[PDB]
Amino acid sequence: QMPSLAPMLEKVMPSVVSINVEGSTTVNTPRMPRGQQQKFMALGSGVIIDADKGYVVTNNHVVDNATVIKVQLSDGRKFDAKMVGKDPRSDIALIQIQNPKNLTAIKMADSDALRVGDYTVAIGNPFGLGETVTSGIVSALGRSNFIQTDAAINRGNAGGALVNLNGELIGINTAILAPDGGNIGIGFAIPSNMVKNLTSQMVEYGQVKRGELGIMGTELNSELAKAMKVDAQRGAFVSQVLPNSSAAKAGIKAGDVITSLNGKPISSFAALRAQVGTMPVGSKLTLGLLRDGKQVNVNLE
Amino acid sequence: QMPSLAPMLEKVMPSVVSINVEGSTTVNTPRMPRGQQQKFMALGSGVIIDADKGYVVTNNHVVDNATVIKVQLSDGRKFDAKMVGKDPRSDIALIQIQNPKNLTAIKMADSDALRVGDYTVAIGNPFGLGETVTSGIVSALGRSNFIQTDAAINRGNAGGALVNLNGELIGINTAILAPDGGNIGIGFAIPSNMVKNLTSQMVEYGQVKRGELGIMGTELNSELAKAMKVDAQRGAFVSQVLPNSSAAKAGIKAGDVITSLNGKPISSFAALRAQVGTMPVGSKLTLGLLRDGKQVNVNLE
Amino acid sequence: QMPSLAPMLEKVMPSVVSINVEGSTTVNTPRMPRGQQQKFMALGSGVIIDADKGYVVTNNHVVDNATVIKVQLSDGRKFDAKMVGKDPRSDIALIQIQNPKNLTAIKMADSDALRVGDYTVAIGNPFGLGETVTSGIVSALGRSNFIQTDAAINRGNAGGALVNLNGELIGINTAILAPDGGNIGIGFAIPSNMVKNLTSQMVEYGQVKRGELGIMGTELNSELAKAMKVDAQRGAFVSQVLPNSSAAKAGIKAGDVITSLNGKPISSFAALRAQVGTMPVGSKLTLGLLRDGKQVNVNLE
Amino acid sequence: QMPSLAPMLEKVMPSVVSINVEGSTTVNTPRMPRGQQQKFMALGSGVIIDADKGYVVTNNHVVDNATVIKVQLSDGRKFDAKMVGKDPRSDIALIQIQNPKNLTAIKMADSDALRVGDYTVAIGNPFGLGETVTSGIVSALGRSNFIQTDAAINRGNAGGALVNLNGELIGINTAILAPDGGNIGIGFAIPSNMVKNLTSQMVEYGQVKRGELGIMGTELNSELAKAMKVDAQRGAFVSQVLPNSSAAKAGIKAGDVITSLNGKPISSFAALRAQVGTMPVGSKLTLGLLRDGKQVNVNLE
Amino acid sequence: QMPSLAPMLEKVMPSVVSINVEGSTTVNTPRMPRGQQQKFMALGSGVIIDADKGYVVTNNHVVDNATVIKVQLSDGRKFDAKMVGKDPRSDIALIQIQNPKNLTAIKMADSDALRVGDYTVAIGNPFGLGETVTSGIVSALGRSNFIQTDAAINRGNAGGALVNLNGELIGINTAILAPDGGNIGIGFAIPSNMVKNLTSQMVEYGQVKRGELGIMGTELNSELAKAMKVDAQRGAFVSQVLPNSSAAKAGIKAGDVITSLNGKPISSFAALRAQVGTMPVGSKLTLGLLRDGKQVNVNLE
Amino acid sequence: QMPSLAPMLEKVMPSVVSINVEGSTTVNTPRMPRGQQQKFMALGSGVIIDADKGYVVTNNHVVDNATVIKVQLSDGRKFDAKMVGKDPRSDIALIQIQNPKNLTAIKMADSDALRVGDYTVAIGNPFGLGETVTSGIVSALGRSNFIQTDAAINRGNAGGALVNLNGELIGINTAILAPDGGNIGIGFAIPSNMVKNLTSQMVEYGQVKRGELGIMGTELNSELAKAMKVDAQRGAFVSQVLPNSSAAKAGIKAGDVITSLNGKPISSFAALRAQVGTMPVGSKLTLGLLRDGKQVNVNLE
Fold this sequence. Notes:
Chains A, B, C, D, E, F: It is found in: Cell inner membrane. The first copy, chain A, has helices spanning 6-12, 60-63, 192-205, 223-226, 270-275, and strands at residues 16-27, 31-32, 36-50, 55-58, 66-73, 78-87, 92-98, 119-124, 132-141, 147-149, 161-163, 169-174, 187-191, 236-237, 257-258, 260-261, 264-265, 286-290, 295-297.
């Protein structure tokens, strides 16, 4: 008969869940005529990632400041969940289902396999009226990072799951304009792998460990810096490398002068110290290193 | 060759029509520096539903306050139409073609058959520049009610017809924010069946008959109400049932205490009287009834 | 030396006070991503009207929903006050100082004596930064009602006291756009007399008694109405007058047909019933009565 | 007793009148969902300028597009008025009272006598709630042109009359942002003399005659222009002067090169042709003429 | 395996390029507190249309006012380009790659072959974050002109290329709201043929030649016009035709009275002179000619 | 004759001047479709404070980022001025007239003498159309600090001079919402004395010296802090006083616990360090000191 997503969607829908948050937050006491605790209600979607432990990935902007979190399965069943870890930078959080039973976990695809022309579908709650599904394609890939897809709802709240035609997880859709869950015109999402890495740090550490690792250099134009080349100057100097932190790994040594980070020119030396320090461990960033030919990819830790 | 909708679209396009409304409306006389009749022009789409009588379904927000309505077929032909019935609640209206000839009516699908993953396409006039077609999927179903689809134009005016891959009618797209024909981010529409039922009441009665039918109960906590259970109180009490209005049908009897209407908890007794009274006859609502197990679906009248 | 208001202002400033309100109010629980009690703080000015009892007139939009109200005298002294009565219609309220001692009350002028060219000065808190004084003239008088004065602060919150050159009370400035304490461009205020009358009803009754008093007529065009004149029809008919409620006083009798209320034509019969029913007792409204010459002023009760 | 404006105000109030306009205007037919004649109502103030003929000066933005204009005297009396002339440039218009009787005309002051520190008061209808009076001083004078005064209402509609302490007319307040009757922050007005001149052209000609009068020159850098000086060039050249139009009067002759008009440098030659051509006859503009010392004041016609 | 666009997209991506403009523009000198040259940076997409000459079509709103334009191929390679021609009306421009080498040009489809149901995909830079691809269908065709497609990004900048399933060029997407590169809700684009014609005029003439060609008629109701029919008047008269400019071609002769231009009624005679004069040569417009049956399509020049 | 300000205004107007600033500022390069130096023009008023040296006080938001500053006297004369010092905190700056000749300096009043009822007048350029004068009264005094006056223009740019009836300087009007020269509804200004002190630091030091002077204490609840009282805790502890910086002057000694600064409670210890550190030397702030009776006024340095 007619082609439809319903078939695969009926295999995926189980592993998607609706999250009902109740929390409190400190707010300014209203001055009139036109600090105190105010109760709010957040509402999102999430995916069951570990059927046995009852691990449910979700967005940090949903579960932030939560006092009580509840989970309802697509079949109607409700559970209590407990926080386990969040990550405001990438807007990802892990919750756990208290008393998990007959749970289906989603099968995660290798996000590295993604290409642009690929079809996707997004499952979530743009307007809070219940689980809404929409389709589209992989519009852009922050590497081949990040996933950008036209399969996203206008004026809607960045829902949860991003899925391929086989009904596997290729990512969690996110809101880039936090603390404002909305749209920029197109959908952004953390690829499924970044998601898995991110998620295991939360299970293991209560959070994702920041990998702020230069090595131990000295500004360009300084004492030990000006001494060397300075032919084709302008950039961030690197004096040492002995810490062996993806530096004896990045094939980097003394004297180098990095001036790139995935395209964007690294002006100052602190420019590196900051940009490479706010990223999540396991990250795959590329550094355009200056020394007459040099550009290696790093892996935090 | 290449896959396209054009083929089926060429079978559906005939049954779609362009409606040109001209009407008058009472307006405030402008006060300056910065009641009277003002002439306006509304513009929509509609579907030929009965080829012989020349019945054309359309949106109430298009044909409301109309003095002269004209219809132009996709082939260029123009006819005069006459109103027959409208329904502001669901934003649906029926017009009739004066002198119908060589008309094609659309084949209506059973909307009950719809599932979420299904593909749809929407035909209409978002910006008045002529008949615009767009595609998408069934994003959400107010039952399996209402149809929500991503196949809807941003900042556009809720067009007319919603159609499956076989070129059958699965619904009429509507504007939830009346009297403002616009978008919320995604498309809403009355499923084709609700459409047909709605439409036949207009033909038969000049309007859709409201089925405001409780039975004849008494508030919870009252004289004849407090007398009974009150174990697990909090809700809307039901004293009688003899009227036999979907009550000797809903398997409901004296003593009951309804507290739901398709999910939303029924607080007061008038809360039922109102919510169940604004709906269209033939409706299929579900009542979470309290009496230690009870929840039956009703059918107005 | 130089002319100044400071002199008289130093005689008036004592009788002006700063009110610090703390209250709670029911608010919607915030839905995110972007009922409960929320604490607010209101802030106004007021005038000591009765030195002995410690009566302080103020604006209802200041003391509304108040849990704790405090009063600070211009000399620094703070007292606790207790509500006694409010009146949202005119935005006037009466509070009482708990433990009043060495209080100065202001001398109230007869507002009836006011003419337009007269000078005024306004004392209050437009921006909450403390007691601000401004001058101007009587721009318009809702009779010679209401007082309109240019002596009002742009974008400011309708302060409290309105005062003449002798330092007497000619009125309390009010906000016409409640619940929004702001400006329309010019200042509105309840004349001092209306203020006094209003204020004594609060002391005496806990509120100002509404004087909704027609008499007992029948719509124009009805049974007992059409029977009479109908020459120069169009208006609100009056059948009876026996209730003697400012009707055996208004020189009104059976058959009359009122069609005015201080200028504005009285269309329907309920138009009178409403307009004359929302006003405060003691009011002085004028009724353009139809019967070939008739227009008398009434005094509620 | 206390100082007040009421006294003089009671001498001026008679000569002020309230204008009630009713008109029609061509408007776009509304396109929905969201040319024809639409009826509006304008409302202003004006001053009786000629008691005998019943001449009432007012603002053009009040009486523009008027079908029926009515006048009500401060004592309550109503008359019908007829248009006589308007002038959108200065926003001034003259209406005539049909059947003038027991009229008081205002005594016009010589505006040339004005200085900045002088006190003024403004009478009008900022918000349509009736005749509102406000005070202030002469904030700026477009000569000593135009009158700018702080005696103007915020967010209000540029009322009518501007008056000194003796109750004489020093000007009519106007709206610079036509067709939007509002405030810029301070009040602008046509001085009383400009008003009188303007007004007599309307009586005499149905409008104010534009005095677009250069003489007959040739652009600077042209054939007959470059031939001469060109020492300290850059400006508008003047070839002839024989027309004797305030040129044999302005002491101007062949060869001149004007480059000023009351301060603003005259760039091109058409820059003069335009700026000096949109002004009202009788105007007093000053031209910074180049020829090594020359700057005379002109008087149109 | 799974269906995807990536395959064909990998064949098309080469012929798409990223344009980095740097230009200057005259701007008003800022007045504070709150003419000069200001440097800006524009950014777009474009398609390699001629591999050998290195012709790259793009949008005029991207390359307008450009001082330096650079081109980067999808493989990373950068070239300098030089302007060759622009066309603000249709928002199309042609640039040339300086030193073109190993270039792939796209294969252009015949746009005339397009039908509505057809699938499309759009490639561009909505938010400047790099080349973004999105899909959709042919929503409307300004003939079967113009192409309207749902394959367009919300709040995005009208990207560049519009492509069918075979990876051929069916058009360049454009911004209708210039000089504001944004969305109306749906995508507009110049069909590929109009594109090719447009583009060859730029190569050949530095611009697209306007074909403002009536013939030589006289207004309806005039001397030589009223003389004839006037039966079913109201329109634009046509006196002559001898110029042979698509008039001895349009089968038009003396006496005619055109009153249409692709639907819109031609009111006046200048209405034709203007509408048919702003269009690009080679255009295919239709004229509803009055003479009791007549409507032929023209081809500029 | 009639009362007016013109007389005294003619004595003050000379000492007021118009400042024409021309400057450059670093701005973001515009990204299109919708760092570099951009030229702007600022415009203000100022007062000649020292006739001989040609010292002209003005607002910092006028002369900030200035490359060329010009001064024009009320009589028309223009001079070049040079910066000497600015002070963004209070928005005050000092410029010097190059080649001062026949200058009149204004006579400064002792601001300490001010009371609220006093009359003021403000001279400046709200809309850039030239020197505008407005009147009013002293609405509030940040001590008897700061001067708040109703003598300020709506939506206008905080002009310059604030003057009493004798034509003496009582202050310079300022904009509290920098870098936005506008109104809050009422006028704020630095009293004339604060002005003089401020201004002499600029002459003497190129700027106003910040008097950030605690003494040398230790947080409350710390080692040397908890040791003492703690009876009626909650505040900022003070351990030492030996620095003799308005501490052996403020009658302050070891052990004290300050918790006020002109009304506002001093929560933390750094709360003092900051608030008392951003103020201008010579300041007169009051500290509510805790030790069972203690509150002395300080004088920076």
